[PDB]
Amino acid sequence: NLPEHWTDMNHQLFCMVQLEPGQSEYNTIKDKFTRTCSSYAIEKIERIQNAFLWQSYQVKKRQMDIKNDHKNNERLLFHGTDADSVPYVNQHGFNRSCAVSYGKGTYFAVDASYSAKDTYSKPDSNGRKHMYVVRVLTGVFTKGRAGLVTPPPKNPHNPTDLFDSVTNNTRSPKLFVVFFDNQAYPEYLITFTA
Amino acid sequence: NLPEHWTDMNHQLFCMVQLEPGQSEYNTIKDKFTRTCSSYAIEKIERIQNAFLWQSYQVKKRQMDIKNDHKNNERLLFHGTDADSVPYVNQHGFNRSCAGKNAVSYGKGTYFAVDASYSAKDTYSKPDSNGRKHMYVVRVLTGVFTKGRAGLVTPPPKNPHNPTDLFDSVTNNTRSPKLFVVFFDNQAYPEYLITFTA
Ligand SMILES: NC(=O)c1ccc(OCc2cccc(Br)c2)cc1
């Protein structure tokens, strides 16, 4: 069940599709980035069409929608990374086994400006920086802490019934951490400069 | 997609089903265990019916079967663990982030044994305060594998010039495999829990 806005892949399962500037889709993604990164220069935006990652993600979304007995389990977040990690993320998504103050998971920012820090979106030998726009199954979350390897339980009376993710601040989150494969789908890759 | 042999779970997502000795399902697992663990005695064998783990596992299996083309991608292996880990494994499966360092490390992942004797070591299936030891029988997507290395946090590439095209798992010895390491969630489905004693 590949999404309607994807483009044909000639019977293949993985493609990076460069977006046409000025079209509805490109405009939407660029605006999410310029809300906090208007001082940067966008070189291109690519749609990630990874059928396998999408299928595993959508299975997890359907399960989380059942478990939590509502939708509203998904957020669009940012992830800055180095050039050498981009091929892996495009093909395999996010891997917690690759500062982790809120737990040993994959970190996602609410604001592109956070992911735009050189510590995350490391400029490559050519000055290029890389940031993903990511569908993240944040679900029901709680405050994180150092050394978590999974989210805490929602009630220590049932230690296996877990929060879906953790954050820095439940009332006004700025970051989320997820601790499982296929809780995050890398949807767009922004290539940009300072 | 739930298997038709499973008990009806009345819209519940999870159940453990105690098997009966003399059924082929029980006997095949007891024989697989006793081939290398005849000095131990089985208390019970439970079928793990975990709808969400099954769904995610079967998605990964279909993907590996597509990608590899006509490989036997799935092996039935053993995993010994401590009693404190059993509720988590039953509900959530095998988390590499929780895995112990193996005495012979072929990577930083979850380990699965070919022989029940390996998993039956107290270092894995730690006896609980009542002398009960716990071993899972696990469907593992071993796929295409190579000899592992202690530094791995994912399987190595098949080709160093294409670093994202990975082996599916690693092993101690490709000609005589006795352990497999997997590095991804939902690559192993806990199918049976064997409770056993000396
Ligand atoms: N890779 C990313 O885009 C990214 C990396 C890290 C991150 O948050 C890390 C963090 C940890 C503790 C305190 C703060 Br404020 C931020 C948020 C996002």
mmCIF file of C-alpha atoms and ligand atoms in Angstrom:
data_model
loop_
_atom_site.group_PDB
_atom_site.id
_atom_site.type_symbol
_atom_site.label_atom_id
_atom_site.label_comp_id
_atom_site.label_asym_id
_atom_site.label_seq_id
_atom_site.Cartn_x
_atom_site.Cartn_y
_atom_site.Cartn_z
ATOM 1 C CA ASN A 1 0.000 0.000 0.000
ATOM 2 C CA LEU A 2 2.569 2.620 -1.215
ATOM 3 C CA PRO A 3 1.339 6.259 -0.823
ATOM 4 C CA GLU A 4 -0.544 8.079 -3.678
ATOM 5 C CA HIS A 5 1.998 11.022 -3.831
ATOM 6 C CA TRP A 6 4.929 8.637 -4.518
ATOM 7 C CA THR A 7 6.034 8.398 -8.150
ATOM 8 C CA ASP A 8 6.346 5.112 -10.158
ATOM 9 C CA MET A 9 9.550 3.072 -9.449
ATOM 10 C CA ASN A 10 9.483 0.723 -12.506
ATOM 11 C CA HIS A 11 8.817 -2.325 -10.235
ATOM 12 C CA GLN A 12 11.692 -1.433 -7.827
ATOM 13 C CA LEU A 13 11.455 -1.049 -4.042
ATOM 14 C CA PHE A 14 13.791 1.938 -3.326
ATOM 15 C CA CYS A 15 14.187 5.358 -4.991
ATOM 16 C CA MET A 16 15.266 8.896 -3.965
ATOM 17 C CA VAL A 17 13.109 11.357 -5.927
ATOM 18 C CA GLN A 18 14.324 14.952 -6.217
ATOM 19 C CA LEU A 19 11.343 17.368 -5.719
ATOM 20 C CA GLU A 20 10.414 20.109 -8.242
ATOM 21 C CA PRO A 21 10.704 23.523 -6.538
ATOM 22 C CA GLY A 22 7.435 25.544 -6.558
ATOM 23 C CA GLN A 23 5.131 22.465 -6.453
ATOM 24 C CA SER A 24 2.754 21.882 -3.510
ATOM 25 C CA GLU A 25 4.881 19.067 -1.956
ATOM 26 C CA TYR A 26 8.273 20.879 -2.170
ATOM 27 C CA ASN A 27 6.658 24.138 -0.854
ATOM 28 C CA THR A 28 5.178 22.266 2.156
ATOM 29 C CA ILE A 29 8.515 20.658 3.195
ATOM 30 C CA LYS A 30 10.597 23.815 2.590
ATOM 31 C CA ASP A 31 8.153 25.853 4.781
ATOM 32 C CA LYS A 32 8.541 23.364 7.697
ATOM 33 C CA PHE A 33 12.344 23.927 7.476
ATOM 34 C CA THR A 34 12.207 27.804 7.018
ATOM 35 C CA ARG A 35 9.996 28.184 10.107
ATOM 36 C CA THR A 36 13.374 28.017 12.031
ATOM 37 C CA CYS A 37 16.139 27.753 9.298
ATOM 38 C CA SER A 38 15.303 30.689 6.966
ATOM 39 C CA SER A 39 19.006 31.880 7.116
ATOM 40 C CA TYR A 40 20.191 28.633 5.364
ATOM 41 C CA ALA A 41 20.371 27.827 1.613
ATOM 42 C CA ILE A 42 18.416 24.724 0.333
ATOM 43 C CA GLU A 43 20.233 22.897 -2.501
ATOM 44 C CA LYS A 44 17.547 20.195 -2.954
ATOM 45 C CA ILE A 45 14.811 18.219 -1.244
ATOM 46 C CA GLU A 46 14.435 14.481 -1.992
ATOM 47 C CA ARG A 47 11.426 12.234 -1.289
ATOM 48 C CA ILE A 48 12.567 8.871 0.164
ATOM 49 C CA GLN A 49 10.593 6.019 -1.421
ATOM 50 C CA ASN A 50 11.625 2.925 0.562
ATOM 51 C CA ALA A 51 8.839 0.328 0.231
ATOM 52 C CA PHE A 52 10.226 -2.043 2.905
ATOM 53 C CA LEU A 53 10.812 0.692 5.553
ATOM 54 C CA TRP A 54 7.377 2.135 4.780
ATOM 55 C CA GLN A 55 5.663 -1.264 5.194
ATOM 56 C CA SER A 56 7.419 -1.993 8.560
ATOM 57 C CA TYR A 57 6.608 1.564 9.776
ATOM 58 C CA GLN A 58 2.921 1.343 8.743
ATOM 59 C CA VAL A 59 2.601 -2.028 10.546
ATOM 60 C CA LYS A 60 3.974 -0.367 13.701
ATOM 61 C CA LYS A 61 1.597 2.600 13.243
ATOM 62 C CA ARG A 62 -1.433 0.321 12.905
ATOM 63 C CA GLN A 63 -0.356 -1.568 16.085
ATOM 64 C CA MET A 64 0.224 1.681 18.022
ATOM 65 C CA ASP A 65 -3.203 3.038 16.863
ATOM 66 C CA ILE A 66 -4.826 -0.205 18.274
ATOM 67 C CA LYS A 67 -2.732 -0.216 21.514
ATOM 68 C CA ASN A 68 -3.404 3.518 22.293
ATOM 69 C CA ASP A 69 -7.058 3.267 21.002
ATOM 70 C CA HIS A 70 -6.596 6.533 18.992
ATOM 71 C CA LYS A 71 -4.649 7.957 16.021
ATOM 72 C CA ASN A 72 -2.540 11.089 16.876
ATOM 73 C CA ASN A 73 0.477 8.763 17.460
ATOM 74 C CA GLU A 74 2.535 10.356 14.645
ATOM 75 C CA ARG A 75 4.591 13.641 14.569
ATOM 76 C CA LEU A 76 6.812 15.118 11.783
ATOM 77 C CA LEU A 77 10.276 15.758 13.252
ATOM 78 C CA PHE A 78 13.811 16.587 12.047
ATOM 79 C CA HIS A 79 17.035 14.549 12.178
ATOM 80 C CA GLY A 80 20.431 16.030 11.292
ATOM 81 C CA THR A 81 23.186 13.580 10.318
ATOM 82 C CA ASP A 82 26.581 13.406 8.583
ATOM 83 C CA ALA A 83 26.954 12.654 4.838
ATOM 84 C CA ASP A 84 28.480 9.202 5.515
ATOM 85 C CA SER A 85 25.252 8.092 7.366
ATOM 86 C CA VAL A 86 22.797 9.244 4.628
ATOM 87 C CA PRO A 87 23.031 6.070 2.418
ATOM 88 C CA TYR A 88 22.405 3.856 5.483
ATOM 89 C CA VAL A 89 19.406 5.937 6.701
ATOM 90 C CA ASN A 90 17.855 6.048 3.206
ATOM 91 C CA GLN A 91 18.023 2.208 2.910
ATOM 92 C CA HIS A 92 17.680 1.031 6.569
ATOM 93 C CA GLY A 93 16.190 3.953 8.550
ATOM 94 C CA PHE A 94 17.323 4.895 12.055
ATOM 95 C CA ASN A 95 19.445 2.594 14.207
ATOM 96 C CA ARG A 96 19.904 3.283 17.948
ATOM 97 C CA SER A 97 23.074 1.050 17.801
ATOM 98 C CA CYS A 98 24.762 3.859 15.741
ATOM 99 C CA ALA A 99 25.196 13.003 23.931
ATOM 100 C CA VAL A 100 22.243 10.706 24.947
ATOM 101 C CA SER A 101 20.960 12.522 28.075
ATOM 102 C CA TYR A 102 17.310 11.270 27.621
ATOM 103 C CA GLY A 103 18.177 7.637 26.707
ATOM 104 C CA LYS A 104 20.051 5.381 24.248
ATOM 105 C CA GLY A 105 17.745 5.803 21.252
ATOM 106 C CA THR A 106 17.442 7.847 18.079
ATOM 107 C CA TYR A 107 16.922 11.599 18.649
ATOM 108 C CA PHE A 108 14.465 13.763 16.696
ATOM 109 C CA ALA A 109 14.034 17.572 16.978
ATOM 110 C CA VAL A 110 10.779 19.546 16.869
ATOM 111 C CA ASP A 111 12.684 22.501 15.302
ATOM 112 C CA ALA A 112 14.877 22.171 12.168
ATOM 113 C CA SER A 113 17.220 24.782 13.777
ATOM 114 C CA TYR A 114 18.193 22.188 16.452
ATOM 115 C CA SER A 115 19.010 19.499 13.820
ATOM 116 C CA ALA A 116 20.849 22.230 11.786
ATOM 117 C CA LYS A 117 23.634 22.379 14.477
ATOM 118 C CA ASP A 118 26.991 21.259 12.968
ATOM 119 C CA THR A 119 27.239 18.570 15.775
ATOM 120 C CA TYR A 120 24.271 16.754 14.075
ATOM 121 C CA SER A 121 24.087 17.867 10.401
ATOM 122 C CA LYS A 122 27.950 17.845 10.110
ATOM 123 C CA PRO A 123 29.043 19.922 7.070
ATOM 124 C CA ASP A 124 30.787 17.584 4.522
ATOM 125 C CA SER A 125 34.138 18.412 2.794
ATOM 126 C CA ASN A 126 32.004 20.558 0.349
ATOM 127 C CA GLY A 127 30.016 22.509 3.073
ATOM 128 C CA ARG A 128 26.828 20.457 2.423
ATOM 129 C CA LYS A 129 24.606 19.673 5.449
ATOM 130 C CA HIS A 130 21.915 16.938 5.571
ATOM 131 C CA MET A 131 18.650 16.844 7.538
ATOM 132 C CA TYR A 132 15.743 14.370 7.334
ATOM 133 C CA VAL A 133 12.065 15.182 7.791
ATOM 134 C CA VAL A 134 10.818 12.082 9.605
ATOM 135 C CA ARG A 135 7.422 10.531 10.418
ATOM 136 C CA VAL A 136 7.896 9.457 14.061
ATOM 137 C CA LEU A 137 5.513 7.299 16.112
ATOM 138 C CA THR A 138 5.883 9.367 19.330
ATOM 139 C CA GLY A 139 2.548 7.944 20.648
ATOM 140 C CA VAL A 140 2.198 8.412 24.444
ATOM 141 C CA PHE A 141 5.413 9.881 25.863
ATOM 142 C CA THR A 142 7.041 10.743 29.169
ATOM 143 C CA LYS A 143 10.180 12.570 30.298
ATOM 144 C CA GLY A 144 13.377 10.642 29.512
ATOM 145 C CA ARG A 145 16.563 10.236 31.546
ATOM 146 C CA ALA A 146 20.119 9.049 30.965
ATOM 147 C CA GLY A 147 20.750 5.332 30.511
ATOM 148 C CA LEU A 148 17.226 4.285 29.336
ATOM 149 C CA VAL A 149 17.418 1.484 26.723
ATOM 150 C CA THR A 150 13.560 1.428 26.288
ATOM 151 C CA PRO A 151 10.854 3.920 27.337
ATOM 152 C CA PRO A 152 9.727 3.584 30.966
ATOM 153 C CA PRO A 153 6.614 1.629 31.920
ATOM 154 C CA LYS A 154 3.351 3.683 32.152
ATOM 155 C CA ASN A 155 2.772 2.021 35.601
ATOM 156 C CA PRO A 156 5.546 0.013 37.393
ATOM 157 C CA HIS A 157 2.658 -2.386 38.414
ATOM 158 C CA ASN A 158 2.740 -3.562 34.706
ATOM 159 C CA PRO A 159 6.455 -3.174 33.811
ATOM 160 C CA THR A 160 6.023 -4.411 30.159
ATOM 161 C CA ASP A 161 3.268 -1.824 29.224
ATOM 162 C CA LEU A 162 5.627 0.930 27.968
ATOM 163 C CA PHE A 163 5.430 4.566 26.905
ATOM 164 C CA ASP A 164 6.021 4.802 23.129
ATOM 165 C CA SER A 165 8.774 7.461 23.355
ATOM 166 C CA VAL A 166 10.444 9.921 25.719
ATOM 167 C CA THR A 167 11.003 13.662 25.520
ATOM 168 C CA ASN A 168 12.895 16.446 27.329
ATOM 169 C CA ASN A 169 9.614 18.116 28.506
ATOM 170 C CA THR A 170 6.091 16.553 28.324
ATOM 171 C CA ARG A 171 4.233 19.953 28.337
ATOM 172 C CA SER A 172 6.435 21.618 25.661
ATOM 173 C CA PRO A 173 8.554 18.992 23.895
ATOM 174 C CA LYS A 174 11.589 19.988 21.813
ATOM 175 C CA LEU A 175 13.065 16.508 21.246
ATOM 176 C CA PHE A 176 11.840 12.911 21.119
ATOM 177 C CA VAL A 177 13.781 9.662 21.510
ATOM 178 C CA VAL A 178 12.531 6.341 20.094
ATOM 179 C CA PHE A 179 14.110 3.034 20.986
ATOM 180 C CA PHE A 180 12.801 0.606 18.340
ATOM 181 C CA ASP A 181 13.444 -0.121 14.691
ATOM 182 C CA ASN A 182 10.675 1.045 12.330
ATOM 183 C CA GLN A 183 9.130 3.711 14.759
ATOM 184 C CA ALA A 184 10.516 6.358 12.377
ATOM 185 C CA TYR A 185 10.201 6.706 8.572
ATOM 186 C CA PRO A 186 12.690 9.068 6.848
ATOM 187 C CA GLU A 187 10.315 10.845 4.473
ATOM 188 C CA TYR A 188 12.412 13.712 2.974
ATOM 189 C CA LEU A 189 16.136 14.544 2.855
ATOM 190 C CA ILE A 190 17.042 18.248 2.784
ATOM 191 C CA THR A 191 20.508 19.111 1.458
ATOM 192 C CA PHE A 192 21.423 22.664 2.584
ATOM 193 C CA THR A 193 24.233 25.100 3.496
ATOM 194 C CA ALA A 194 24.797 27.835 6.126
ATOM 195 C CA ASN B 1 -2.427 -12.996 9.289
ATOM 196 C CA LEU B 2 -2.512 -15.078 12.557
ATOM 197 C CA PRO B 3 -1.806 -18.849 12.186
ATOM 198 C CA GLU B 4 -5.038 -20.953 12.112
ATOM 199 C CA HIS B 5 -3.602 -23.512 14.644
ATOM 200 C CA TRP B 6 -3.402 -20.769 17.355
ATOM 201 C CA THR B 7 -6.000 -20.694 20.143
ATOM 202 C CA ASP B 8 -8.754 -18.086 19.729
ATOM 203 C CA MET B 9 -7.565 -15.130 21.830
ATOM 204 C CA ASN B 10 -11.004 -13.339 22.071
ATOM 205 C CA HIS B 11 -9.548 -10.102 20.498
ATOM 206 C CA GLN B 12 -6.610 -10.205 23.066
ATOM 207 C CA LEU B 13 -3.129 -9.506 21.512
ATOM 208 C CA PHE B 14 -1.132 -12.000 23.608
ATOM 209 C CA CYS B 15 -1.419 -15.471 25.207
ATOM 210 C CA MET B 16 0.870 -18.317 26.402
ATOM 211 C CA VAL B 17 -0.553 -21.766 25.582
ATOM 212 C CA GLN B 18 0.600 -24.803 27.553
ATOM 213 C CA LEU B 19 1.178 -27.774 25.192
ATOM 214 C CA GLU B 20 0.328 -31.401 25.970
ATOM 215 C CA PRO B 21 2.944 -34.165 25.880
ATOM 216 C CA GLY B 22 2.125 -36.729 23.166
ATOM 217 C CA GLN B 23 1.031 -34.017 20.697
ATOM 218 C CA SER B 24 3.443 -33.752 17.724
ATOM 219 C CA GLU B 25 3.889 -30.009 18.503
ATOM 220 C CA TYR B 26 5.178 -30.750 22.043
ATOM 221 C CA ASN B 27 7.142 -33.887 21.057
ATOM 222 C CA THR B 28 9.096 -32.145 18.186
ATOM 223 C CA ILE B 29 10.292 -29.419 20.609
ATOM 224 C CA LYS B 30 11.087 -31.948 23.362
ATOM 225 C CA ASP B 31 13.103 -34.042 20.824
ATOM 226 C CA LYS B 32 14.947 -30.920 19.504
ATOM 227 C CA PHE B 33 15.886 -30.005 23.110
ATOM 228 C CA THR B 34 16.781 -33.574 24.277
ATOM 229 C CA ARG B 35 19.081 -34.137 21.246
ATOM 230 C CA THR B 36 21.706 -32.103 23.223
ATOM 231 C CA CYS B 37 20.052 -31.673 26.719
ATOM 232 C CA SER B 38 19.089 -35.252 27.744
ATOM 233 C CA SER B 39 20.511 -34.618 31.323
ATOM 234 C CA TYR B 40 17.766 -31.962 31.964
ATOM 235 C CA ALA B 41 14.011 -32.489 32.317
ATOM 236 C CA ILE B 42 11.256 -30.356 30.823
ATOM 237 C CA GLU B 43 8.622 -28.963 33.207
ATOM 238 C CA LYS B 44 6.427 -27.471 30.469
ATOM 239 C CA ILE B 45 6.407 -26.072 26.920
ATOM 240 C CA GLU B 46 4.304 -22.973 26.125
ATOM 241 C CA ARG B 47 3.398 -21.695 22.659
ATOM 242 C CA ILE B 48 3.888 -17.885 22.548
ATOM 243 C CA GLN B 49 0.936 -16.241 20.668
ATOM 244 C CA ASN B 50 2.036 -12.588 20.283
ATOM 245 C CA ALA B 51 -0.007 -10.998 17.495
ATOM 246 C CA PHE B 52 2.071 -7.794 17.099
ATOM 247 C CA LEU B 53 5.501 -9.564 17.234
ATOM 248 C CA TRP B 54 4.216 -12.157 14.725
ATOM 249 C CA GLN B 55 2.937 -9.459 12.322
ATOM 250 C CA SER B 56 6.220 -7.482 12.366
ATOM 251 C CA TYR B 57 8.346 -10.668 12.080
ATOM 252 C CA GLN B 58 6.286 -11.995 9.139
ATOM 253 C CA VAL B 59 6.742 -8.603 7.385
ATOM 254 C CA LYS B 60 10.564 -8.876 7.793
ATOM 255 C CA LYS B 61 10.456 -12.522 6.589
ATOM 256 C CA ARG B 62 8.465 -11.624 3.438
ATOM 257 C CA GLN B 63 10.965 -8.794 2.756
ATOM 258 C CA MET B 64 14.009 -11.088 3.241
ATOM 259 C CA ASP B 65 12.402 -13.807 1.045
ATOM 260 C CA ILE B 66 11.865 -11.131 -1.694
ATOM 261 C CA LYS B 67 15.388 -9.695 -1.374
ATOM 262 C CA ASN B 68 17.302 -13.026 -1.199
ATOM 263 C CA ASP B 69 15.302 -15.044 -3.857
ATOM 264 C CA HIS B 70 14.771 -18.790 -2.932
ATOM 265 C CA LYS B 71 16.939 -18.904 0.234
ATOM 266 C CA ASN B 72 15.905 -20.839 3.341
ATOM 267 C CA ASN B 73 16.025 -17.540 5.326
ATOM 268 C CA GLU B 74 14.572 -18.930 8.611
ATOM 269 C CA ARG B 75 16.159 -21.290 11.180
ATOM 270 C CA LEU B 76 14.672 -22.573 14.472
ATOM 271 C CA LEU B 77 17.196 -21.738 17.217
ATOM 272 C CA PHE B 78 17.427 -21.571 21.023
ATOM 273 C CA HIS B 79 17.837 -18.645 23.418
ATOM 274 C CA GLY B 80 18.466 -19.148 27.122
ATOM 275 C CA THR B 81 17.649 -16.263 29.447
ATOM 276 C CA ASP B 82 16.998 -15.297 33.036
ATOM 277 C CA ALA B 83 13.546 -15.377 34.617
ATOM 278 C CA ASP B 84 13.555 -11.548 35.032
ATOM 279 C CA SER B 85 13.738 -11.179 31.182
ATOM 280 C CA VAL B 86 10.878 -13.627 30.360
ATOM 281 C CA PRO B 87 7.900 -11.168 30.722
ATOM 282 C CA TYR B 88 9.695 -8.608 28.463
ATOM 283 C CA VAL B 89 10.691 -11.219 25.791
ATOM 284 C CA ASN B 90 7.163 -12.703 25.759
ATOM 285 C CA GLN B 91 5.626 -9.226 25.104
ATOM 286 C CA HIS B 92 8.383 -7.360 23.206
ATOM 287 C CA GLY B 93 10.832 -9.946 21.776
ATOM 288 C CA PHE B 94 14.640 -9.797 21.703
ATOM 289 C CA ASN B 95 16.217 -6.386 22.311
ATOM 290 C CA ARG B 96 19.910 -6.156 21.253
ATOM 291 C CA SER B 97 20.228 -3.114 23.629
ATOM 292 C CA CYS B 98 19.655 -5.529 26.610
ATOM 293 C CA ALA B 99 21.905 -8.386 25.310
ATOM 294 C CA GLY B 100 24.842 -9.712 27.355
ATOM 295 C CA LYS B 101 28.429 -9.784 26.014
ATOM 296 C CA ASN B 102 28.847 -13.429 24.828
ATOM 297 C CA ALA B 103 31.979 -15.287 26.122
ATOM 298 C CA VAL B 104 32.962 -15.567 22.417
ATOM 299 C CA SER B 105 31.695 -12.343 20.792
ATOM 300 C CA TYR B 106 30.950 -12.294 17.039
ATOM 301 C CA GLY B 107 29.187 -8.903 17.366
ATOM 302 C CA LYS B 108 27.028 -6.660 19.553
ATOM 303 C CA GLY B 109 23.641 -8.278 18.860
ATOM 304 C CA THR B 110 21.173 -10.917 20.130
ATOM 305 C CA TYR B 111 22.626 -14.484 20.138
ATOM 306 C CA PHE B 112 20.785 -17.671 19.186
ATOM 307 C CA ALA B 113 22.133 -21.211 19.479
ATOM 308 C CA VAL B 114 21.825 -24.169 17.113
ATOM 309 C CA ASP B 115 22.113 -26.582 20.100
ATOM 310 C CA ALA B 116 19.918 -26.426 23.219
ATOM 311 C CA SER B 117 23.039 -27.507 25.237
ATOM 312 C CA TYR B 118 24.632 -24.079 24.620
ATOM 313 C CA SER B 119 21.504 -22.151 25.718
ATOM 314 C CA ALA B 120 21.153 -24.587 28.718
ATOM 315 C CA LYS B 121 24.368 -23.182 30.309
ATOM 316 C CA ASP B 122 23.571 -21.405 33.596
ATOM 317 C CA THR B 123 25.376 -18.299 32.150
ATOM 318 C CA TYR B 124 22.299 -17.946 29.781
ATOM 319 C CA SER B 125 19.303 -19.845 31.249
ATOM 320 C CA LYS B 126 20.116 -18.671 34.813
ATOM 321 C CA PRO B 127 18.318 -20.904 37.341
ATOM 322 C CA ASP B 128 15.612 -18.900 39.188
ATOM 323 C CA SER B 129 15.091 -19.124 42.973
ATOM 324 C CA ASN B 130 13.036 -22.391 42.399
ATOM 325 C CA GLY B 131 15.708 -23.999 40.146
ATOM 326 C CA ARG B 132 13.694 -23.347 36.946
ATOM 327 C CA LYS B 133 15.691 -22.588 33.799
ATOM 328 C CA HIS B 134 14.090 -20.856 30.807
ATOM 329 C CA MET B 135 14.868 -21.359 27.082
ATOM 330 C CA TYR B 136 13.030 -19.925 24.064
ATOM 331 C CA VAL B 137 12.677 -21.742 20.753
ATOM 332 C CA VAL B 138 12.893 -18.933 18.196
ATOM 333 C CA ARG B 139 12.224 -18.458 14.469
ATOM 334 C CA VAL B 140 15.277 -16.454 13.364
ATOM 335 C CA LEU B 141 15.789 -14.776 9.985
ATOM 336 C CA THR B 142 19.427 -15.842 9.535
ATOM 337 C CA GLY B 143 19.219 -15.239 5.776
ATOM 338 C CA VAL B 144 22.643 -14.940 4.129
ATOM 339 C CA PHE B 145 25.382 -14.886 6.788
ATOM 340 C CA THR B 146 29.124 -14.606 7.253
ATOM 341 C CA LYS B 147 31.589 -15.068 10.138
ATOM 342 C CA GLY B 148 31.068 -12.247 12.628
ATOM 343 C CA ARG B 149 33.551 -10.011 14.478
ATOM 344 C CA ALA B 150 33.351 -8.576 18.022
ATOM 345 C CA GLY B 151 33.242 -4.935 16.800
ATOM 346 C CA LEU B 152 30.029 -5.312 14.707
ATOM 347 C CA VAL B 153 26.906 -3.295 15.704
ATOM 348 C CA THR B 154 25.176 -4.375 12.383
ATOM 349 C CA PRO B 155 26.012 -7.262 9.991
ATOM 350 C CA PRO B 156 28.878 -6.396 7.690
ATOM 351 C CA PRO B 157 28.385 -5.465 4.042
ATOM 352 C CA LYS B 158 28.684 -8.242 1.446
ATOM 353 C CA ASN B 159 30.831 -5.840 -0.602
ATOM 354 C CA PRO B 160 33.024 -3.123 0.938
ATOM 355 C CA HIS B 161 32.288 -0.775 -2.022
ATOM 356 C CA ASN B 162 28.514 -0.981 -1.287
ATOM 357 C CA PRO B 163 28.438 -0.546 2.491
ATOM 358 C CA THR B 164 24.578 -0.521 2.818
ATOM 359 C CA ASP B 165 23.971 -3.988 1.207
ATOM 360 C CA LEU B 166 24.284 -6.140 4.297
ATOM 361 C CA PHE B 167 24.490 -9.763 5.307
ATOM 362 C CA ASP B 168 21.309 -10.669 7.220
ATOM 363 C CA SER B 169 23.156 -12.184 10.224
ATOM 364 C CA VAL B 170 26.555 -13.435 11.336
ATOM 365 C CA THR B 171 27.795 -16.715 12.795
ATOM 366 C CA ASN B 172 30.802 -18.193 14.573
ATOM 367 C CA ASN B 173 31.723 -20.518 11.639
ATOM 368 C CA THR B 174 30.027 -20.541 8.161
ATOM 369 C CA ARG B 175 30.898 -24.236 7.406
ATOM 370 C CA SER B 176 29.692 -25.416 10.897
ATOM 371 C CA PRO B 177 27.410 -22.718 12.377
ATOM 372 C CA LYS B 178 26.557 -23.125 16.093
ATOM 373 C CA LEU B 179 25.477 -19.554 16.918
ATOM 374 C CA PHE B 180 23.850 -16.711 15.015
ATOM 375 C CA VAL B 181 23.784 -13.031 15.906
ATOM 376 C CA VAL B 182 21.036 -10.668 14.673
ATOM 377 C CA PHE B 183 21.174 -6.907 14.955
ATOM 378 C CA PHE B 184 17.615 -5.745 14.120
ATOM 379 C CA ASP B 185 14.259 -5.748 15.887
ATOM 380 C CA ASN B 186 11.628 -8.196 14.605
ATOM 381 C CA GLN B 187 14.263 -10.555 13.043
ATOM 382 C CA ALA B 188 13.449 -13.237 15.692
ATOM 383 C CA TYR B 189 10.014 -14.454 16.867
ATOM 384 C CA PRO B 190 9.888 -16.186 20.286
ATOM 385 C CA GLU B 191 7.690 -19.185 19.406
ATOM 386 C CA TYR B 192 7.999 -21.533 22.465
ATOM 387 C CA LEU B 193 9.164 -21.108 26.045
ATOM 388 C CA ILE B 194 10.699 -24.262 27.572
ATOM 389 C CA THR B 195 10.738 -24.305 31.387
ATOM 390 C CA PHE B 196 13.114 -27.035 32.604
ATOM 391 C CA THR B 197 15.104 -28.265 35.601
ATOM 392 C CA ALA B 198 18.094 -30.470 36.476
HETATM 393 N N1 LIG C 1 20.299 14.343 15.149
HETATM 394 C C1 LIG C 1 19.429 15.282 15.507
HETATM 395 O O1 LIG C 1 18.861 16.056 14.676
HETATM 396 C C2 LIG C 1 19.263 15.458 16.877
HETATM 397 C C3 LIG C 1 20.283 15.085 17.783
HETATM 398 C C4 LIG C 1 20.131 15.298 19.141
HETATM 399 C C5 LIG C 1 18.996 15.890 19.658
HETATM 400 O O2 LIG C 1 18.834 16.170 20.990
HETATM 401 C C6 LIG C 1 19.977 15.900 21.871
HETATM 402 C C7 LIG C 1 19.847 16.577 23.089
HETATM 403 C C8 LIG C 1 20.181 15.918 24.270
HETATM 404 C C9 LIG C 1 20.105 16.536 25.525
HETATM 405 C C10 LIG C 1 19.664 17.836 25.631
HETATM 406 C C11 LIG C 1 19.315 18.504 24.448
HETATM 407 BR BR1 LIG C 1 18.697 20.342 24.483
HETATM 408 C C12 LIG C 1 19.412 17.885 23.201
HETATM 409 C C13 LIG C 1 17.958 16.237 18.784
HETATM 410 C C14 LIG C 1 18.111 16.025 17.399
#
